Amino acid sequence: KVFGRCELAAAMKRHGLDNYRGYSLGNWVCAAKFESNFNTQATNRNTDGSTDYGILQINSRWWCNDGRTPGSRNLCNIPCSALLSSDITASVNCAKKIVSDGNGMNAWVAWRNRCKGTDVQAWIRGCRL
């Protein structure tokens, strides 16, 4: 499913991402926009052989298992296909683990290069939530 900005902001809030680990909602929404264009089915293959899955583009080398990434650690103990679902629960739940990593949202290159230090509040403005 392809989410709307406000549609996604509310689903993330409801799933407990607003200010999770100190990152306000606009950060999570900004990240998803640049990571998957709000599309839950997005996948992107990496040079090292791993693939990124879903709305938050979670990587198959550490977080999920896609059965084709040797040295996969599957930290969120879930098959990667579970992250492509129209229900963002598994992505949100695994994302909470990644952000708790000790590296924050820097784990998402699109967040680091395009969201970090911008008025991220602009991403939820006008949304009911």
Helix content: 25-40%
Major beta sheet, specifics? Answer: 3 strands, antiparallel
Principal-axis shape: globular
CATH topology: Lysozyme
Give an overview in words.
This protein is mainly alpha-helical and 129 residues long. It has a single domain, classed as Orthogonal Bundle (Lysozyme), CATH 1.10.530. 31% of the residues lie in helices and 6% in strands. It is built from 4 helices and 3 strands, in the order H-H-E-E-E-H-H. The chain has helices at 5-14, 25-36, 89-100, 109-114, and strands spanning 43-45, 51-53, 58-59. The protein has a 3-stranded antiparallel sheet. Helix 1 (5-14) packs across helix 2. The longest helix is centred in the N-terminal third of the chain and has 12 residues, at 25-36. It is globular and about 45 Å long. It starts with a helix and ends in a 15-residue tail after the last helix. It comes from Gallus gallus. GO terms for molecular function: beta-N-acetylglucosaminidase activity; identical protein binding; lysozyme activity. Substrate binds at residue 101. Its main location: secreted.
